[PDB]
Amino acid sequence: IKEKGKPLMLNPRTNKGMAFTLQERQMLGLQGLLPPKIETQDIQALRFHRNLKKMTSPLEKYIYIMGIQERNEKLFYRILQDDIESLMPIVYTPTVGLACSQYGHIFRRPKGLFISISDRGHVRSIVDNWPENHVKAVVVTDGERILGLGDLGVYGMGIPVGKLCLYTACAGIRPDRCLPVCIDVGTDNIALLKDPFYMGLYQKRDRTQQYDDLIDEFMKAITDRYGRNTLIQFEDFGNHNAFRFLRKYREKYCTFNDDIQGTAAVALAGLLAAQKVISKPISEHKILFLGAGEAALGIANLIVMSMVENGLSEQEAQKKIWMFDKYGLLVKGRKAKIDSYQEPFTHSAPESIPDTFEDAVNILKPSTIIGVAGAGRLFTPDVIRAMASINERPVIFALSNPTAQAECTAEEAYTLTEGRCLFASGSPFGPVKLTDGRVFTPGQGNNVYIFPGVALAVILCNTRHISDSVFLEAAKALTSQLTDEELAQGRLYPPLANIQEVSINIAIKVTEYLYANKMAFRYPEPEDKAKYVKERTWRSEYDSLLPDVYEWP
Amino acid sequence: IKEKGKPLMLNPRTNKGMAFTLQERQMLGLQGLLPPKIETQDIQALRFHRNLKKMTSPLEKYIYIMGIQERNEKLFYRILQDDIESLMPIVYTPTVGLACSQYGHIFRRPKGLFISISDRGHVRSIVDNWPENHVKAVVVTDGERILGLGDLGVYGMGIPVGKLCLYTACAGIRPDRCLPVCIDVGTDNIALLKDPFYMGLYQKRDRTQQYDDLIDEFMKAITDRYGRNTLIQFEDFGNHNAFRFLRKYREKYCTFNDDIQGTAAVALAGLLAAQKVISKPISEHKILFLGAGEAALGIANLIVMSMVENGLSEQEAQKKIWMFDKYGLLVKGRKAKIDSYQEPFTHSAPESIPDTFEDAVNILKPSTIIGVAGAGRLFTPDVIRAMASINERPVIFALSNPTAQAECTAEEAYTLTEGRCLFASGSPFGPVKLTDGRVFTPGQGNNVYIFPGVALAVILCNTRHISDSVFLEAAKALTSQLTDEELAQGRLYPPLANIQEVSINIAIKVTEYLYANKMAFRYPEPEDKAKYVKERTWRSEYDSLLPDVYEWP
Amino acid sequence: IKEKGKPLMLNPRTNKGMAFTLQERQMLGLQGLLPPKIETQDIQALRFHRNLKKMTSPLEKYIYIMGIQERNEKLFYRILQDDIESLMPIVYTPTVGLACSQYGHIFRRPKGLFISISDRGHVRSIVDNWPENHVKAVVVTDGERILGLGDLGVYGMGIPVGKLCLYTACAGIRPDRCLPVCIDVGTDNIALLKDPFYMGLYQKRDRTQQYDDLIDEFMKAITDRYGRNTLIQFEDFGNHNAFRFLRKYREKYCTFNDDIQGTAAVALAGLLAAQKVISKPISEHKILFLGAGEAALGIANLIVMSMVENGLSEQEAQKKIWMFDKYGLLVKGRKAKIDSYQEPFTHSAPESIPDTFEDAVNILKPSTIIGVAGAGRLFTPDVIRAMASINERPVIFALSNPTAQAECTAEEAYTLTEGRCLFASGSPFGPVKLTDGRVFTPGQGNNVYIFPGVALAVILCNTRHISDSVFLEAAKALTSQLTDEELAQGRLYPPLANIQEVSINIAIKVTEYLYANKMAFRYPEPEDKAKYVKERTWRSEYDSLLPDVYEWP
Ligand SMILES: NC(=O)C1=CN([C@@H]2O[C@H](COP(=O)(O)OP(=O)(O)OC[C@H]3O[C@@H](n4cnc5c(N)ncnc54)[C@H](O)[C@@H]3O)[C@@H](O)[C@H]2O)C=CC1
Ligand SMILES: NC(=O)C1=CN([C@@H]2O[C@H](COP(=O)(O)OP(=O)(O)OC[C@H]3O[C@@H](n4cnc5c(N)ncnc54)[C@H](O)[C@@H]3O)[C@@H](O)[C@H]2O)C=CC1
Ligand SMILES: NC(=O)C1=CN([C@@H]2O[C@H](COP(=O)(O)OP(=O)(O)OC[C@H]3O[C@@H](n4cnc5c(N)ncnc54)[C@H](O)[C@@H]3O)[C@@H](O)[C@H]2O)C=CC1
Ligand SMILES: NC(=O)C1=CN([C@@H]2O[C@H](COP(=O)(O)OP(=O)(O)OC[C@H]3O[C@@H](n4cnc5c(N)ncnc54)[C@H](O)[C@@H]3O)[C@@H](O)[C@H]2O)C=CC1
Ligand SMILES: NC(=O)C1=CN([C@@H]2O[C@H](COP(=O)(O)OP(=O)(O)OC[C@H]3O[C@@H](n4cnc5c(N)ncnc54)[C@H](O)[C@@H]3O)[C@@H](O)[C@H]2O)C=CC1
Ligand SMILES: NC(=O)C1=CN([C@@H]2O[C@H](COP(=O)(O)OP(=O)(O)OC[C@H]3O[C@@H](n4cnc5c(N)ncnc54)[C@H](O)[C@@H]3O)[C@@H](O)[C@H]2O)C=CC1
Ligand SMILES: O=C(O)/C=C/C(=O)O
Ligand SMILES: O=C(O)/C=C/C(=O)O
Ligand SMILES: O=C(O)/C=C/C(=O)O
Ligand SMILES: [Mn+2]
Ligand SMILES: [Mn+2]
Ligand SMILES: [Mn+2]
């Protein structure tokens, strides 16, 4: 490091608290500024869990652990490392959504960059204000579609912050190379415009061309200072902007959209694991989505790429996918609109026009149901029963987040199908024991299983662009890690407790894929991709800060 | 910049002296720390020239101007840019040599990084001590062969410093992106080892494997911190080491040796200029070298490549070249050793064995004489007359530096050949006027015309390896700028006064060459290379340091 | 030491150069930034004297050593300490006057605080930009009366800088606690108003209420930040502003005017020494001043106090003093003005009014002549001859500075009076050897023998105000250190070569005087004033910058 003395303690990237050794204190001007006691990171972790055990609400736990990231970075991650499964719900979905809807009530310190429409023309100067000189990964949101909570404006900064925590906790990406970003062009949230604690501009969203220019100016500014190959992950943008920005920049920068592409991969991985148990002919596979937005289209497009890779033409596969949105079933010539992306899955109206999602299930008789509407408990008991009656082993994915917007619970899916369904959800649910002793451990179909591993691979290989093919390879890399014993439990995904090793493995597989397809530019090409990746992961163990002292001959 | 206040004035990189505008001083905390007067860089320039003109000795002018580099970087380069031609002999050769032989007496502040054998195993920590974060180019020496002055140890640091100033002065390579380096493993200079002002370790050179490993450690440290693409220019390394390191690293790193390859392109560019005068074919020209070291072998190899590029084969080309070293004519089976690089130019002993260099000229009757033995006035009157009697338009290159080690003077060569010789020297020589009022302006055969333009291209194209073929095009690029009128005056090279435009022009050719030959990795490839290179050269004009202030809507 | 890395080398306060030990280099992040050689201050000193020896002009040597102050403060004073006597003429008078005349030509880096009239209402903001936190002594000037050179505007900043160097070199006052200040309200010097290099405001002097308000503002801003007892020494202000500001502030701040009071003490001390080689009766003392401004009036009033301290009343002592300015003898009723301060020394026109200073010498027949007109050689040979015939041992003091403005030289004084005079001058003159062989060593009556010791005592005792009594004591303290031998050489002051010891002795005696008269507020009162002062003098030897590293039991 460059500085010594108090500054070392005030900066969380370097502060170690009482873990600063005696020599470090004396040589770096800290003696007397710390209590006489010398501690280990282990003692500090104990302090943490000791106090966490006594806390009552998830939000309170969020504020506390999240505060550690602003005081002692190394320890913050040592804490996540100790038990990522139990803390995931706190730092990530669903509690992060809770934090976001209340971001202005719990604010203590800011985190990340805020670029508003009012800064148009001066974005580059905002990017130069960021302290870190070598940013490799950016996660950006404009806060219009925060989880299934809708438009939360700048209160959505909570999402990019959470995603990045996982870049480091899951894939070992250096936190100092990560930058959370929030684009504030206003918010249509009437309640927030009336909140005296709101953190953004008090104006409705700017949807004119100035908005696209702002985004343009941001992509330009970020790459100018950090590099053309800086990984830019779009997160929680509205439906229209999400697809547009993805297609406008995907071939120009090293960018992707988590909601559209990372989701697609995790979902596909779940369906793959499922096919392992079901083993049914793909000619008998009929899928039906509740909702036809970002994730539905992304999932459907990757399912098609999977089916095509498996024989069917692109046109035959798309006919095997249906969608049901807020206006009803997506069929040709319906009163409600249908965008360019939905058309491919908009088919000739069947015998009857289903009025409810239930009718749709009975009429179309799908074998797989995927909920991604973010509208609540729409996979009603009748839907689940209809599914269990129609299929011996129905696949039921309720992916909407947070928990209250989920289509159904694990407990509802398993009991209403007598333990026959193959379930996955976006938000966490604990094990389910049926009235007959059978225990079913549900898996979490959440994009966190993908973006960390993919991001690591892309950064390490100096990749310039990300094609949909990477996510397909990621899908296969995730489900390829499922053992048969975990399959028996009802797990369509590796245990969340192993998310770190699982992410690394996905990173290794994707790096092998990028190189083999001339998508990597990090020369020389590593001989052992496995040893290469593992060798470059950031660790939470304290580094010695002592200067290099030695005797001259 | 991150700081404000006095530090801005203490760091030459940012210090503008009285050039800081009123608004900059108020907002940065300099009000009152500077005189009320607001000056322009133009005024600062005048002050400089006013003082220099009063100065008497070259060394004195050296101390003064080099002192400016450590007070106001921008001003330093503006001063050079003002009149590169007249300042060249002061900051560069021959005065730079004078400075080196006396580095310990005129020392005020150190420049660049010093890595000593005593720091083995701890070289990375030394590299990390360097303030600048984005280093793109390194010029390193061990002071074994400083000009034709010999082993000067750490006193040779003056060379890497002098070389880098030209990177900026000539080719516009950002100064903060440059790093001069001195590897001190001791020195054999008996006198220095007795001087109380010597700046190096008091011990003779370490020629064991430790030297090799130190160099290895250095290459690894630099690359690891700044990127394996970082340009490493080897300068004034002893004979043995110069070749071996070039061979060993040109494949692994983006390195090259200036004394071997840079010179090769200058000397070749000279001959190419001669051709447009003599028109003499390639089946013509019998070349004789005085000395067979780094530069001779380098020029020979590039010459051969140009002949082979024009019909002739390598075997019949290498025969048109002869070398005479401190041991006499280099012929097969002679007593003196003949290294691997010299073998290709070691032909069967002639009918008679040349006793002295004058004899070798009469017997062999060369049409081009090239001196690079750093041994003195060896292109004696007799030697020059002989070349006159034997040729109509003889080519005489006395490239040895500094001035006192050159083979002959511009006057000696022109008067002794009645103005028919085509001359070039390593160090500068003023115009020559013959008794018949005929005036000849001799060019300078110095690699300064090469390394700057090449360095700029390599760096801008993100090149990873430098092939000798880059130098061949470098030579062509240089000569392709010699206008007819300049040929007449007796100029084998573009006027040294235009060395800036020449360098930029060269850089453009090489970048187009590099891309056209898939050696460039800077994406996207620029359509207009010219526009590309000129947009990226560093300017000596002052930049505003004002924060980005603006009103919100 | 709170900073590490390059910053330690860029700051002259901490820069040790190659004297940084290996241990400090490794622990402070300097390894590799300095040559492998470890030097001592002794070696660096040698390098300095070696180069100084070569130099030809005094201004050149000035530019050189003053540059060292801006690079290595410790070494700067070591060099001065090594031979304060020979460097005195270069760093102080007369060369410092030459430097001020060319300040804008030789400018490299600014020194001190610059407060301009354009800054009124923001002076505190300027004072807060000064890097040092504990300032104890300020020396300020407006540059209207720089030596006998006149109005030099901001070019006069060189004077305060020169005085402060002596604060440290002579009295051991801490460099970082001294603050040179230049108040710029414009200049009347027409030459500078058309000089493109002039460092000040381009306007004639502002003499409205604004001037006075600026100074008031300055005085308040300084004390507000550093303390009401911050020693503030006024230097080279115009005659009208010198007395009025001294009168206005001497009871509100810890301030004094060097030109009026310091001079007074050194001049009187010279007379006191003279009396010891003449034993002349007070009733025989007749003093005539050439000039009647700051210096003259200051000296007169101090002489008057010494006489009153010995019996004579104010009235009778005051009549022993005559003055002659640029309009002639000050006699009651003369057409030329006579201000309040001059009245006590304005007599009734004698029988015949002397037209020239020679007529005044012959008519009044004084026994002591003191020149402070700064108008050149007014002590013509006829004048000196007249003094030789009226008095057996004529007292001749040519105090005007620099040398060209002196009233006469040392050679002219001793030669013209045949060695029967007691001579002293404001500027240095070497020894004088008459044809008869006799050698005379002239003393230098310059306020440099006073302000250092006086300021040191005033600072160490936390004195709130300085009365004329202090200077009367300093005057006595200085002459008391004179040893007969030296007095026998023609010395009216102790050898300049020992100004360090002499200054300290004056500091001791003055501190004892301040306490004895309850003017000192430093508590507790030191028992041994000598050990108290000697212990607090700053030293030039290097201090270890090593952190306090120790093991715990
Ligand atoms: N678990 C995971 O990895 C991921 C989960 N999601 C979740 O999926 C939900 C939607 O996200 P996006 O597709 O990006 O949103 P979007 O706004 O792009 O699409 C929403 C879709 O749901 C439909 N919809 C709304 N109400 C409906 C209703 N009452 N009945 C039937 N359909 C209805 C809309 O017509 C629209 O087609 C969110 O809650 C989000 O958190 C999104 C990405 C990944
Ligand atoms: N744009 C860039 O990435 C640039 C990198 N460099 C330097 O190159 C050095 C790396 O050398 P290589 O052996 O080529 O790289 P590498 O093999 O260590 O890794 C390749 C790329 O992945 C990044 N990386 C490594 N670990 C990372 C982590 N844990 N989290 C996030 N990003 C990580 C690196 O910055 C590098 O750009 C670095 O020390 C850096 O200072 C210099 C200029 C630009
Ligand atoms: N391999 C590399 O050099 C990479 C550089 N970057 C980043 O990209 C930024 C520059 O923008 P790009 O469009 O990539 O490059 P560019 O097209 O502006 O220039 C290409 C290379 O030449 C260097 N450069 C430009 N002008 C220079 C000058 N006048 N003197 C010395 N070096 C000069 C740049 O640092 C860059 O590495 C840098 O700040 C760097 O952090 C990111 C990835 C790789
Ligand atoms: N102007 C330019 O661009 C360049 C000029 N030079 C200058 O050329 C000189 C040598 O450079 P390198 O080839 O690197 O050195 P080197 O040490 O590799 O080669 C020296 C050669 O000269 C020969 N030699 C020594 N004394 C001799 C004598 N008394 N009579 C005949 N031959 C003798 C040696 O046998 C040896 O082959 C130096 O003075 C150097 O400054 C080197 C590179 C470029
Ligand atoms: N970093 C800082 O700002 C520091 C400030 N101090 C100051 O020192 C005072 C404590 O008194 P001591 O230092 O024990 O001495 P002291 O009390 O014996 O000295 C009396 C006064 O003379 C001044 N002084 C002593 N030597 C001086 C010198 N060589 N040159 C110029 N001024 C000198 C001191 O500032 C002090 O105000 C405190 O008022 C404290 O504010 C002490 C250490 C550090
Ligand atoms: N050696 C020392 O320690 C000191 C020497 N001086 C020197 O004394 C000189 C005057 O200083 P200040 O009293 O502050 O100046 P001032 O401006 O206050 O007074 C100058 C006096 O000299 C008179 N004068 C000018 N030309 C004259 C002439 N042609 N003939 C007779 N009298 C003439 C003026 O009328 C005026 O009374 C300066 O050259 C200065 O450098 C001042 C302070 C200390
Ligand atoms: O530090 C806090 O808890 C809150 C700060 C704020 O309200 O800005
Ligand atoms: O001897 C030194 O290290 C410094 C010399 C200077 O600043 O002139
Ligand atoms: O003219 C200036 O501002 C500085 C000159 C120098 O540092 O030499
Ligand atoms: Mn999302
Ligand atoms: Mn060289
Ligand atoms: Mn004065």
XYZ file of N, CA and C and ligand atoms in Angstrom, chain A residues 134 136 172-174 177 226 459-460 462 522 532 536-538, chain B residues 134 224-228, ligand 2:
107
model
N -8.044 0.143 -11.306
C -8.084 -0.993 -12.192
C -9.360 -1.814 -12.110
N -12.266 -4.112 -13.241
C -12.453 -5.135 -14.265
C -13.921 -5.530 -14.467
N -14.351 -15.525 -6.250
C -13.019 -15.024 -5.944
C -12.526 -13.832 -6.749
N -13.444 -13.045 -7.290
C -13.073 -11.857 -8.049
C -12.691 -10.774 -7.036
N -11.560 -10.101 -7.263
C -11.085 -9.042 -6.363
C -12.101 -7.916 -6.203
N -11.657 -4.552 -7.772
C -11.742 -4.511 -9.231
C -13.215 -4.500 -9.629
N -10.962 2.349 -17.963
C -10.546 1.022 -17.514
C -10.268 0.003 -18.608
N -13.324 -12.388 -17.455
C -12.320 -11.427 -17.034
C -10.910 -11.999 -17.212
N -10.707 -13.230 -16.758
C -9.409 -13.887 -16.840
C -8.903 -14.146 -18.253
N -9.631 -12.210 -20.846
C -9.576 -10.973 -21.612
C -10.559 -11.081 -22.774
N -5.966 -13.657 -23.586
C -4.944 -13.576 -22.560
C -3.793 -14.504 -22.960
N -4.785 -22.562 -13.585
C -4.733 -21.154 -13.929
C -5.771 -20.351 -13.147
N -5.660 -17.678 -9.492
C -5.986 -16.263 -9.494
C -7.196 -15.793 -8.694
N -7.706 -16.633 -7.800
C -8.862 -16.227 -7.018
C -8.441 -15.445 -5.778
N -9.179 -14.383 -5.483
C -8.896 -13.545 -4.329
C -9.246 -14.300 -3.059
N 0.974 3.104 -14.605
C 0.772 2.596 -15.948
C 2.010 2.719 -16.821
N 5.102 -8.501 -14.669
C 4.048 -8.839 -13.730
C 3.301 -7.624 -13.194
N 4.000 -6.514 -12.997
C 3.314 -5.352 -12.477
C 2.643 -4.480 -13.533
N 3.264 -4.347 -14.703
C 2.698 -3.481 -15.734
C 2.112 -4.168 -16.964
N 2.264 -5.483 -17.057
C 1.742 -6.191 -18.212
C 2.884 -6.784 -19.008
N 2.684 -7.983 -19.541
C 3.727 -8.649 -20.307
C 3.905 -8.029 -21.682
N -6.691 -4.219 -18.439
C -5.975 -4.985 -17.619
O -6.435 -5.974 -17.065
C -4.511 -4.537 -17.376
C -3.684 -5.292 -16.516
N -2.329 -4.872 -16.261
C -1.425 -5.624 -15.311
O -1.196 -6.997 -15.744
C -1.051 -7.836 -14.547
C -1.641 -9.213 -14.766
O -0.775 -9.940 -15.666
P -1.279 -11.277 -16.444
O -0.394 -12.411 -16.068
O -1.461 -10.960 -17.866
O -2.723 -11.532 -15.834
P -3.409 -12.716 -15.077
O -3.103 -13.957 -15.803
O -3.041 -12.615 -13.642
O -4.978 -12.378 -15.254
C -5.488 -11.892 -16.510
C -6.466 -10.724 -16.276
O -7.425 -11.081 -15.197
C -7.376 -10.057 -14.154
N -7.482 -10.674 -12.797
C -6.619 -11.581 -12.200
N -7.151 -11.969 -11.015
C -8.279 -11.305 -10.933
C -9.144 -11.438 -9.860
N -8.903 -12.270 -8.859
N -10.289 -10.694 -9.895
C -10.542 -9.866 -10.956
N -9.660 -9.773 -11.995
C -8.511 -10.512 -11.977
C -6.095 -9.299 -14.355
O -6.269 -7.912 -14.057
C -5.728 -9.491 -15.820
O -6.122 -8.339 -16.604
C -1.743 -7.110 -13.409
O -0.901 -7.083 -12.230
C -2.012 -5.698 -13.915
O -1.395 -4.726 -13.060
C -1.826 -3.702 -16.890
C -2.648 -2.955 -17.752
C -3.994 -3.366 -17.998
